[PDB]
Write a protein that binds this ligand. Structure first.
Ligand SMILES: *[C@@H]1O[C@H](CO)[C@@H](O)[C@H](O)[C@H]1NC(C)=O
Ligand SMILES: *[C@@H]1O[C@H](CO)[C@@H](O)[C@H](O)[C@H]1NC(C)=O
Ligand SMILES: *[C@@H]1O[C@H](CO)[C@@H](O)[C@H](O)[C@H]1NC(C)=O
Ligand SMILES: *[C@@H]1O[C@H](CO)[C@@H](O)[C@H](O)[C@H]1NC(C)=O
Ligand SMILES: *[C@@H]1O[C@H](CO)[C@@H](O)[C@H](O)[C@H]1NC(C)=O
Ligand SMILES: *[C@@H]1O[C@H](CO)[C@@H](O)[C@H](O)[C@H]1NC(C)=O
Lengths: 37, 998
């Protein structure tokens, strides 16, 4: 949608690790699944 | 209990410098005027404090010297002074005092004895390793208290001993000791000292004594003129300090590392890593008393001050005597084969007995330790490998027996064992610090909240000072602070309870001292600017602030000392300074009517003075000499900054040429030089007060002489003389006056055309709307009024100095600037000393470069500030000079119809006069007087035709109708000569039937 929704902080973690890549996990049953993000 | 008023006593010479007829401000230890001084008469230890003022009038000389020893015994070095008749012998050497030190009568200084109705004033001080003694001996009239007056204390001796002097004792030489000596204690104070031409201090002023004294210090003058003076700032200090961190909740598993009911063994010591928890050691200290609790890195209390990201816990059970092996740098079986702490270990070793719990009668063989390893273990290592030790040179072949032994062997712990073999529980805590964010700390403390008071606050790591009140603002849940438009904190969320507290800055404001002249009185009033009277004699609240010492009076007077929003203070006369709402002026209601006019019946010739600055002092600055002086290193360093000196020189040269142009524009209006005739008769008009006086060599008029009497090197600073001398400006003024007197306004617009002065003044009367007959019929009266006004001008100028306040101001400002520019040569600007040669001599070149650079930056900034202020002042003076030139052209070389430009009234003529750096204009004006009420009509109806006056107005005395000029009542019979018809009778409103003759 075309509108302003200001995002609010939830969690700040003192992890201190360098992150270079990421991945999304999904609850798929090995049932068809299709999620779009 | 004898206590006396100190009066104005105890002022000494701060340093060795001589000063003549100057007022100097010093921040030094001193005896405050009118202070708490103890008159003494067994003898306890008197504290020396920072210093002591000892005033003894003891003629009997029961007091022989002083004991400044800090112990009055042989323990430490005691300073002992003897002031016998022979000599004063300051002794420091180690003396074995007798049981009763009194005579029947290393570091030694022998001098002439201090003693000679003598007032022995002594000041004893000890600063920067020097003990200073100041003395004064003055005759006193018959009095048992300190005399009223001023006495300066000359230095007497300095000692380089510089030892700690905490207590001082008056030496006893006989036991009833009744000695009449006053003792006061000195304080860090700011003083203002007035030196005479002889070099001595005649008087002094204590700044923090009273508001009038504060304003004397601020103005650096002992006499304060009438006015309001901003002196200091007023701030409400924080009463209490508040620290607020979040609810201590969550906590480190310290109750689990202990009380584990099983510690495994020491051959494989349990390693526990703890992080991200609230550190609380109350349970640790509340556990059983500890056989051995040694901390190697930090103090146990300061453990809470230091925050650690990683805390390592190692728990094991060892014998009693093996605890000593668990220490940095220890050699032993357990230390080298089971668990080795590093040489630089930082942690706490905690050990407590476990015989009550971990000892079994049958023998607890669970706990094991290693007693055969190939080599020593590296620090912080755990070796759990248990294979057949190969002590023999034959292969063990995986079996044991001959020369092949099991690496591990167990303790057998039984309760009957004595100390030294009983099982001890040891929990070694290890702390590690690595360069990453931490987020692991100890019980952050918190205090009770204080509201509606000026408090220091530290709310969740945000520090500040202010007044905390309740706030209507509603924060979002994740927010903590509130910040306003100027990026200043205005609200805070309390961590412990989620409450929005608004922060208000604590009350602060200027302090102004409303004073009459010091000549008139010494009473003062104090205005706290912008402060509510609750936050701070008679207290009054005004929009300006809070006024203390002035009483509000309902009646209104003309403003004398401005304060604020319509409030003025004055010394009207117990009766004292009063504050009132200023009166704008007398209320006058003009009797307006449809047919009422007021015509003047007489006139007043009024002469007024207008003083205008024209030029300012021309100054040239040598940038290199000011910044650097004779130092070549400073010049080389200055070359790097650029061409700043060239720009400053260009600006100052521009100002100087502009000043010359200003004087030329104002005074060089006429090219010819006109001379007044030797026979000085001008129809009864006496111009002696404005014309030059040939008797005195100056060739200046009496008014010019009065003005010159009233108004009337360094370091690269030079004052360049003006191009036109005072004599040349006098010649210009004489030429302008002679031209005005002889030629009227004709000399301004072309050739000078002679005209008798009465005719010129008649034409000026025509210029202001009054006929010539008025002047020619009233010539003697006009002449007498002009003469009286010119006579009064001299007295008005001489009696009131403020009339010449403009020109003098300019001079003062210039001097002040120069003084500042020189005074900042003595300022350090963050260097070692203001003297460049001292810095160069004491410090090596590489280190001296930074000090010289700081001095250069400070001095160059000072020069830039001076030049910018000079440019702004030059702009102001140029505006004033342009106004003066316009007035000279339009008021002196002509008659101006502009209102209030040339005097107040109807302008007739202006006379110029020269004053130091300016021009004084004597404006002659026509003021109507003695007005009379008449009935007036817009037109007169005769023969069915309207009639309007050609010049003037129709007036009636009640029965008869006349026509008269506006500015003078000269009634004339209405005739066709002074009227024009222009219309019929019906249109005009207010027409009056009457007769017009021919
Ligand atoms: C007094 O003091 C001086 C100072 O050294 C000393 O020479 C003299 O002998 C002393 N006289 C007495 C009274 O002991
Ligand atoms: C101080 O100076 C004045 C100058 O008139 C002089 O009369 C007086 O003797 C001086 N006081 C001294 C030298 O103690
Ligand atoms: C902290 O403890 C106090 C104790 O009364 C409680 O009122 C407060 O709500 C706690 N803090 C938070 C953020 O819940
Ligand atoms: C001073 O405080 C009082 C306290 O009620 C208040 O009424 C008054 O308005 C305050 N003065 C100013 C100028 O705000
Ligand atoms: C008004 O003026 C006339 C002169 O024309 C004089 O005779 C008369 O007395 C004056 N009286 C009044 C009404 O003022
Ligand atoms: C002036 O005279 C005319 C002539 O008739 C008359 O009508 C008028 O009323 C007179 N003026 C006044 C004010 O009466």
């Amino acid at each position: 949608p075309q509108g302003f929704s200001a995002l609010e902080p939830l969690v700040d973690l003192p992890i201190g690790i360098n992150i270079t890549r990421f991945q999304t996990l999904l609850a798929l049953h090995r049932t068809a699944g299709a999620a779009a993000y | 209990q004898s206590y006396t008023n100190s009066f104005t006593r105890g002022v000494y010479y701060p340093d060795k410098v001589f000063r003549s007829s100057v007022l100097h401000s010093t921040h030094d230890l001193f005896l405050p005027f009118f202070s708490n001084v103890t008159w003494f008469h067994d003898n306890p230890a008197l504290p020396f404090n920072d210093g002591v003022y000892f005033a003894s009038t003891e003629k009997s000389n029961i007091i022989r010297g002083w004991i400044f020893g800090t112990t009055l015994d042989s323990k430490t070095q005691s300073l002992l002074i003897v002031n016998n008749a022979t000599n004063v012998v300051i002794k420091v050497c180690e003396f074995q005092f007798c049981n009763d030190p009194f005579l029947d009568v290393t570091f030694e200084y022998v001098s002439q004895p201090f003693l000679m109705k003598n007032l022995r004033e002594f000041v004893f001080k000890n600063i920067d390793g020097y003990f200073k003694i100041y003395s004064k001996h003055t005759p006193i009239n018959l009095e048992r208290d300190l005399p009223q007056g001023f006495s300066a204390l000359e230095p007497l001796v300095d000692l380089p001993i510089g030892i700690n002097i905490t207590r001082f004792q008056t030496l006893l030489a006989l036991t009833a000791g009744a000695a009449a000596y006053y003792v006061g204690y000195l304080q860090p104070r700011t003083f203002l000292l007035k030196y005479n031409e002889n070099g001595t201090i005649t008087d002094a002023v204590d700044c923090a004594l009273d508001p009038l004294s504060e304003t004397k210090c601020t103005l650096k003058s002992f006499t304060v003129e009438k006015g309001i003076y901003q002196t200091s700032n007023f701030r409400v200090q924080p009463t209490e300090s508040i620290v607020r961190f979040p609810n201590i909740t969550n906590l480190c598993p310290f109750h689990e590392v202990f009380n584990a009911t099983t510690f495994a063994s020491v051959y494989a010591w349990n390693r526990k890593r703890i992080s991200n928890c609230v550190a609380d050691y109350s349970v640790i200290y509340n556990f059983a008393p500890f056989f051995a609790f040694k901390c190697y890195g930090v103090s146990p209390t300061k453990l809470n001050d230091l925050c650690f990201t990683n805390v390592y816990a190692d728990s094991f059970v060892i014998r009693g005597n093996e605890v000593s092996q668990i220490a940095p740098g220890q050699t032993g079986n357990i230390a080298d084969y089971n668990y080795k702490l590093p040489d630089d270990f930082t942690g706490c070793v905690i050990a407590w007995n476990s015989n009550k719990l971990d000892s079994k009668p049958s023998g607890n063989y669970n706990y094991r330790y290693r007693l055969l390893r190939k080599s020593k273990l590296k620090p912080f290592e755990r070796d759990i490998s248990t294979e057949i030790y190969q002590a023999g040179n034959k292969p063990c072949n995986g079996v044991a027996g001959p020369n092949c032994y099991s690496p591990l062997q167990s303790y057998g712990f039984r309760p009957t064992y004595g100390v030294g073999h009983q099982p001890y529980r040891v929990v070694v805590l290890s702390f590690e610090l690595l360069h990453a964010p931490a987020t692991v700390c100890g019980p952050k403390k918190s205090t009770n909240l204080v509201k509606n008071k000026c408090v220091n606050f530290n709310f969740n790591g945000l520090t500040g000072t202010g007044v905390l009140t309740e706030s209507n603002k509603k924060f979002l849940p994740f927010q903590q602070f509130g910040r306003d438009i100027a990026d200043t904190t205005d609200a805070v969320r309390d961590p412990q309870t989620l409450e929005i507290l608004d922060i208000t800055p604590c009350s602060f404001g200027g302090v102004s001292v409303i004073t009459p002249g010091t000549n008139t009185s010494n009473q003062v009033a104090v205005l706290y600017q912008g402060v509510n009277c609750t936050e701070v004699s008679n207290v009054f609240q005004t929009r300006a602030g809070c006024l203390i010492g002035a009483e509000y009076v309902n009646n209104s007077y003309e403003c004398d000392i401005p304060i604020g929003a319509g409030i003025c203070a004055s010394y009207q006369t117990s009766q004292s300074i009063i504050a009132y709402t200023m009166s704008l002026g007398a209320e006058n209601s003009v009797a307006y009517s449809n047919n009422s006019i007021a015509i003047p019946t007489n006139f007043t010739i009024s002469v007024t003075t207008e003083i205008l600055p024209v030029s300012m002092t021309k100054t040239s600055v040598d940038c290199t000499m000011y910044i650097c002086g004779d130092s070549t290193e400073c010049s080389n360093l200055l070359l790097q900054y650029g061409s700043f000196c060239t720009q400053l020189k260009r600006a100052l040269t521009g100002i100087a040429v502009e000043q010359d142009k200003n004087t030329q524009e104002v005074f060089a209006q006429v090219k010819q030089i006109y001379k007044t005739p030797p026979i000085k008769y001008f129809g009864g008009f006496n111009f002696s007060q404005i014309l030059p006086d040939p008797s005195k060599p100056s060739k200046r008029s009496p008014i010019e002489d009065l003005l010159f009497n009233k108004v009337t090197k360094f370091n690269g600073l030079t004052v360049l003389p003006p191009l036109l001398t005072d004599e040349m400006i006098a010649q210009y003024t004489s030429a302008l006056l002679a031209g005005t007197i002889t030629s009227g306004w004709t000399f301004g617009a072309g050739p000078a055309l002679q005209i008798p002065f009465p005719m010129q003044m008649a034409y000026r009367f025509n210029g202001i709307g009054v006929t010539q007959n008025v002047l020619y019929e009233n010539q003697k009266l006009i002449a007498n009024q002009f003469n009286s006004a010119i006579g009064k001008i001299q007295d008005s100028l001489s009696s009131t100095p403020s009339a010449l306040g403009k020109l003098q101001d300019v001079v003062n400002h210039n001097a002040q600037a120069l003084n500042t520019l020189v005074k900042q040569l003595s300022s350090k600007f963050g260097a070692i000393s203001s003297v460049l040669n001292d810095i160069l001599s004491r410090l090596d070149p590489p280190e001296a470069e930074v000090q010289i650079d700081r001095l250069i930056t400070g001095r160059l900034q000072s020069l830039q500030t001076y030049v910018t202020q000079q440019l702004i002042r030059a702009a102001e003076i140029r505006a004033s000079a342009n106004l003066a030139a316009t007035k000279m052209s339009e008021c002196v070389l002509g008659q101006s119809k502009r209102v209030d430009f040339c005097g107040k009234g109807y302008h007739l003529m202006s006379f110029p006069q020269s004053a130091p750096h300016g021009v004084v204009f004597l404006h002659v004006t026509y003021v109507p007087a003695q007005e009379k009420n008449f009935t007036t009509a817009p037109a007169i109806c005769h023969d069915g035709k309207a009639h309007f006056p050609r010049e003037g107005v129709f007036v009636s005395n009640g029965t008869h109708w006349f026509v008269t000029q506006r500015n003078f009542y000269e009634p004339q019979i209405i005739t066709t000569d002074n009227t024009f018809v222009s219309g019929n009778c019906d249109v005009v409103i207010g027409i009056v039937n009457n007769t017009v003759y021919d």
